[PDB]
Amino acid sequence: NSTAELEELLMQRSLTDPQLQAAAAAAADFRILPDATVIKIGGQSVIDRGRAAVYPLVDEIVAARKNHKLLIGTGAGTRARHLYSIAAGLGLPAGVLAQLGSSVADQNAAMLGQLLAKHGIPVVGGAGLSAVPLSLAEVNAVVFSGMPPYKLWMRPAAEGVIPPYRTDAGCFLLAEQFGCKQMIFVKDEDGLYTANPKTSKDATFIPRISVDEMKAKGLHDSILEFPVLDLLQSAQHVREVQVVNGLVPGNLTRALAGEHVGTIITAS
Amino acid sequence: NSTAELEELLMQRSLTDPQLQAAAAAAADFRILPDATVIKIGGQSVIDRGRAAVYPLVDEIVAARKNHKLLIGTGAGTRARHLYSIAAGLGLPAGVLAQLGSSVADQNAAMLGQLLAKHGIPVVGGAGLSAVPLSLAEVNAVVFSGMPPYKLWMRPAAEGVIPPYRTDAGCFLLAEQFGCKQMIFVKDEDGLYTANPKTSKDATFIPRISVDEMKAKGLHDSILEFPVLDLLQSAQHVREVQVVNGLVPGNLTRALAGEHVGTIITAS
Amino acid sequence: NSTAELEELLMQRSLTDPQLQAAAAAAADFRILPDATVIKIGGQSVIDRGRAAVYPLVDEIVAARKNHKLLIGTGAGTRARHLYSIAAGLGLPAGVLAQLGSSVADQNAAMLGQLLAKHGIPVVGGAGLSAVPLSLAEVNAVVFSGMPPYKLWMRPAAEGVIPPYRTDAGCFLLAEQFGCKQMIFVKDEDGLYTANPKTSKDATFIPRISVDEMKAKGLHDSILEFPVLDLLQSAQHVREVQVVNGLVPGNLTRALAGEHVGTIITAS
Amino acid sequence: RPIRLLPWLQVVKIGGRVMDRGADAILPLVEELRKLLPEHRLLILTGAGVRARHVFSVGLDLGLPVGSLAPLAASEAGQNGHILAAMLASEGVSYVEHPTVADQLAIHLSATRAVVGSAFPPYAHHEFPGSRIPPHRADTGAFLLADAFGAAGLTIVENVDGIYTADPNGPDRGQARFLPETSATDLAKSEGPLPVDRALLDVMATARHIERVQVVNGLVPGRLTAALRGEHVGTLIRTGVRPA
Amino acid sequence: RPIRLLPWLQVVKIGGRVMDRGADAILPLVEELRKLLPEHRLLILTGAGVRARHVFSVGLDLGLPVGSLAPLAASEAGQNGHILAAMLASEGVSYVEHPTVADQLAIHLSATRAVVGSAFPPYAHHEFPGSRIPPHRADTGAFLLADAFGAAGLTIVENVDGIYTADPNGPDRGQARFLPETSATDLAKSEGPLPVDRALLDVMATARHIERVQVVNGLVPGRLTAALRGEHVGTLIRTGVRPA
Amino acid sequence: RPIRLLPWLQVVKIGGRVMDRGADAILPLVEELRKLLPEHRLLILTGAGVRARHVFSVGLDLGLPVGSLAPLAASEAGQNGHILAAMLASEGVSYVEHPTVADQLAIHLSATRAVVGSAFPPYAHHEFPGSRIPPHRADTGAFLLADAFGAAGLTIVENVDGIYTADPNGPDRGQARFLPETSATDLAKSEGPLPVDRALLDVMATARHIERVQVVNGLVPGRLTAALRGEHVGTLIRTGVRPA
Ligand SMILES: Nc1ncnc2c1ncn2[C@@H]1O[C@H](COP(=O)(O)OP(=O)(O)OP(=O)(O)O)[C@@H](O)[C@H]1O
Ligand SMILES: Nc1ncnc2c1ncn2[C@@H]1O[C@H](COP(=O)(O)OP(=O)(O)OP(=O)(O)O)[C@@H](O)[C@H]1O
Ligand SMILES: Nc1ncnc2c1ncn2[C@@H]1O[C@H](COP(=O)(O)OP(=O)(O)OP(=O)(O)O)[C@@H](O)[C@H]1O
Ligand SMILES: Nc1ncnc2c1ncn2[C@@H]1O[C@H](COP(=O)(O)OP(=O)(O)OP(=O)(O)O)[C@@H](O)[C@H]1O
Ligand SMILES: Nc1ncnc2c1ncn2[C@@H]1O[C@H](COP(=O)(O)OP(=O)(O)OP(=O)(O)O)[C@@H](O)[C@H]1O
Ligand SMILES: Nc1ncnc2c1ncn2[C@@H]1O[C@H](COP(=O)(O)OP(=O)(O)OP(=O)(O)O)[C@@H](O)[C@H]1O
Ligand code: MOO
Ligand code: MOO
Ligand code: MOO
Ligand SMILES: [Mg+2]
Ligand SMILES: [Mg+2]
Ligand SMILES: [Mg+2]
Ligand SMILES: [Mo]
């Protein structure tokens, strides 16, 4: 490889050309925010539950940002499910539902951000940054809405009109594209089980699992949006994620401290 | 009361239902920026007067932000009165005049903000925040335009087309909705008098008065936009305001220090 | 002179009136960011060259912002020249090309900004500020796109459709209008020579020269956009500029330290 | 009095709770709106409905003030506007944002026969204190706009026939008598729930142009069409603007 | 030379000081504009007028540089555009922002017969130094746009009959002789006040399409209409673009 | 299946490398587009072309991830859209931004016969990882939009006749056989370069409306016109949506 060979391919071939694709893969790898952790605060699993769930997590965020740089993305939750149901019954496409769901994640970011405002932590928006570098350097944390920006360009699922890339995917992709050191999903269960613990009696807790093992166990679509597992296997920077129960006091703090609470899901 | 009883009312009744209204009134009360002070810098009374008035207040803002978190909103002044006169003579409605007046308050925020830029203090905009939490945490002050965002949805006065909610109301409502600890109006008189001190010989100074007492004295429409007095009586967080003379050196500094310069107007 | 005489002229005369123009010239002169240095990072001369040129300058920016407040504007480079060639061949006017060139300078600001993000340095945009005062106070540096905002209102050159005010002019005008203490153009040559050093064998290096001397030597259009030289002669605040070679390790650092590397071009 | 900016405009406010019924209510309404496009120049504004009650539930539980809840509710009205506009897209209808409604409505209604916007006004964090529930909601915003424009009318499309003396779906449904006609001042002097914002009655008191607002049942096809022709098929609210 | 983007466009710049006269001047102008809508495709651009002098007074007293004063003045021209557009709203006319004028004017003039924008160019903090008074003002911005578009004309609507040899309202009013026709180069070589920006003469020197600009008295009904038909009712400024 | 939002829409994607040829290619295409305006309602979307290869060269040299390169490339497609729209401005055509395409396309195509936008989708820093080259590019964005709208068709305007078995400009040009018709699934199972994004084939697999996409040579006047009438003048790609 060389810069000249890569630039020659880049000028003379289609971007679909395997030779170009392979030369581009040898490029150096810059991590934009390598010291930051992305955390997703679930909409249905946390913010929809109101004060009993949100206030302890606010306290943890405030305590954590002393020693940890945090990008805190919000899920959407039951109001997005309602919008999806109205729009799906009208026959509207996934690209229309994608924008409806984003508004709900924005509401949740605004609510969480207003509880954090007096600690200096802003809500930031965009399909990328602007306000992120300065806020991370000065107050060590920002809040963002977790939904991807695809809008009408959302890729539909194989079946149905529910957007397949929602706030798990949105937060994961940001962690991946910023080259963050860690991705923590904050939900309302201790982690992954062998079956849905809300609808099954004797599901067994899984501390650690690979994406391939999850698929073989029929857990492709369980505690994470299933497309996130495929994104994870393709990722360059974030090759494992941790799922923790934000309803347990101090669980986020302990996860940020390196404690293996919850489930660690690995790309391989 | 309970969360469940409130949520049941919220689902099953009109928001106009008195029972719902009463259950909502029992909700906890979060103050978003409880340590901040909102200050309004008058347009006609201060910024229109140019350097002799503005430069000493810039010095006070710079000295004050060491020990005080400040949200500094600007009034509009004579250019807004000119726009109101042109638009009123054309028969245009209050909602159109509201936007014209906002542009003037924006001009004043930009002028004041450029004198403060080298001290790190930004101009911020929006019908709310974004840039406020981070700026308050880092440089202890922000400048904003004081006009409310109602635009064409401005409620008209009972008579005439002048918008009744202008920059006194805009700044007050921000102080109230952020739950700030203090609201200081910076004008060009020492405070409230029993009559307009510019057009009356022997008006008497009033150090402290309630809104009800002001109305009984015929002072409903005097040193503050009269709708502000009604907003003040409805407020949850800011139940008194202080009016001070920004043309007196150090008056803002002393008001921020707890000195009773000027007039304190109380909701009750 | 007096404020009253100036305000009387301002009300009663055309702004074209020489008497008004002269009274306005006696106004006090406020510098908005007097301690800041504007630096332009060339598009063709630096950023287009990729890592070997950009990474050392990133290191210098990071080291410099400890003791220096920096506004770092980006040039455009070969992609803008390509857009100009397509649009000029279609007969499109300078005002259309101006917007095309700005997009390229924006791309370069985004690339540079992402290398600086982990050091807290943001990309900021607008025909002025917003994010500049806070970022300068907190992280001592910002990155901005260098193209002026004139869009379709770009003044055309006397001949041809290439916009005459591009990123040299954009950065210079910002330095001038903010009253910055210093303007450094970072290019790919040690400074000004008596002829183009890339196409001439024995050009002689010029450490210091005035704009008038440059014009007399036929160097009107050499290492800087020629309109910049006229802007420089009209400037109130930035009356000299320094051109340095950003490909020389530490050259920007040494220029910021007061070392006379490169060429100093003076208005008079 | 102020001039009428858009005297030929008809404003139609669609209740958020009508939208909440989904396709069963929205499809007939969309077909009725389609047939109205060649007859009127329409600004169609959507309310918020049940999702705003949920975000009020969460927001109040978190302690948030009324200036925080107002834009959270306005978001749901905006989402209803995007949904309804998508259904009329093939007729040339799009959702337009508040600044566009405020400043460019004339050119948009020149381009196409109707546009959809959010009925909530952008009071946002400058909402008035007093109640923990944002007072200036979809009915109030729609009326403020319609009256500011000097529009030919405002029709409020509800999930009930009009205003009753009691909530016809509430505990006292049995006592609820239909009011074919009322005045804003009479409604304001009553206590008890209404299907329209209480703040609607206050802005009607200061109105400059709109003399009457009809509340009609959007669940009955044809009532909106009849209402836009002035036929009396719901509750007429007299605003207290006097005719010439 | 560059192509003409909008060869069928007529650009009309309304002086800020015309707007400053209020209804007495604006109502006749609005009625004349109304009658012109079916005859021309109009971009109507407003200048700033006296309010920009006030903000210059305050800004200069505060020491602010010319890059700070320029957008403060442009704001007043924008406000004049919102006022004028509101008066023509019932004809389908709206104010459109600078980015929309710059990039989407064609679709907006397809939707409706005229739009209103701010005549000031967005030089903002990149205004040129030299004078403490922003040089690129409403006349200059309107001409830059009109010439960039290759428009069929630019008409400048003033509060005086045209250009005189002296300010016809100034100390030397008695010596002021009307100039029915002049060239930009002749005007540029004179010292003394003009009713048009001095920078207008400079951008006329580099113009690519517009051959003449007429300054007409908007206080005389019918002069704008006659000017848009090429009739000579004010001062013609020859730009020094040569005809084919 | 989902409803068709804009069933009467024709979407035309112009290759960035067609635009890169400059006036020699763009002027005939502009004249052909002009003649098509009265026949179809057009959303014209531009790809990126060679400038995106240059910014990929710089960005990859700087180490930047694929979420950083995606919006850098999308910028070039946007610039191509501004250029093409400027050429059609006198016909009422303007460039419109992504949020406007997403939410207000219906009103804009009511105002005028065609608009231009960027074919890239706004995946920006949420582009998928895997390749260092952004996968969701101009073909993919144009198809996502066209299928989401339920448009009557998507035509891809290339600098070659269609899809061949090898790059007809590459090292193996001699083996390159023209494919008059193919299916997305057959193309996806091949390795080797294509003139369309590989991601285009993936979104075709989940498509809901568009049954076929033709790739035609925009360098041959008349092929776009014939393609928009369903005539077979390039490579037809069957998406695997089945007809009724
Ligand atoms: N095998 C499993 N193990 C653990 N949880 C599971 C499993 N299968 C399904 N779940 C469910 O997944 C849920 C977490 O996903 P959910 O979408 O509720 O979270 P969220 O991030 O809050 O969503 P949003 O943010 O979109 O509202 C759990 O509440 C749990 O009931
Ligand atoms: N009883 C009173 N006591 C004191 N001042 C009064 C009284 N009645 C009227 N005023 C007038 O109110 C003025 C303050 O209100 P004014 O609107 O000028 O201030 P402002 O906040 O600068 O306005 P804006 O910001 O809208 O320009 C004083 O200058 C004073 O002349
Ligand atoms: N007399 C001269 N002395 C030095 N350099 C000269 C001279 N005349 C011409 N040049 C050329 O000017 C170039 C610097 O201008 P150039 O436009 O390349 O820089 P830039 O700021 O990177 O441009 P952009 O940012 O617009 O891409 C040098 O690379 C050099 O070849
Ligand atoms: N006096 C009354 N007359 C008629 N309906 C009433 C009355 N009081 C309460 N209601 C209730 O109001 C309901 C309508 O609720 P609401 O007005 O909140 O919905 P909406 O107008 O669709 O919502 P939004 O204000 O968000 O647009 C009716 O179905 C009815 O049950
Ligand atoms: N040589 C001149 N000929 C004619 N009028 C002149 C001349 N010199 C000065 N003037 C003055 O210019 C005045 C017009 O002022 P000006 O041009 O500033 O207003 P405007 O064009 O309405 O404002 P704006 O530039 O903000 O749109 C005339 O009324 C006249 O008094
Ligand atoms: N199998 C193939 N069949 C046809 N052309 C191919 C094939 N493989 C590679 N190509 C090349 O693809 C070129 C078109 O390049 P590309 O598709 O990148 O341009 P574009 O579509 O104009 O750009 P953009 O995707 O930015 O709009 C053709 O000229 C041809 O050389
Ligand atoms: O929102 Mo629009 O449709 O031209 O301004
Ligand atoms: O500003 Mo607009 O873009 O009327 O459709
Ligand atoms: O972008 Mo626009 O919304 O032409 O009316
Ligand atoms: Mg209702
Ligand atoms: Mg003039
Ligand atoms: Mg291609
Ligand atoms: Mo907008």
Ligand SMILES: [Mo]
């Ligand atoms: Mo906008």
Ligand SMILES: [Mo]
């Ligand atoms: Mo805009």
Ligand SMILES: [Mo]
């Ligand atoms: Mo915009």
Ligand SMILES: [Mo]
């Ligand atoms: Mo936009």
Ligand SMILES: [Mo]
């Ligand atoms: Mo927008």
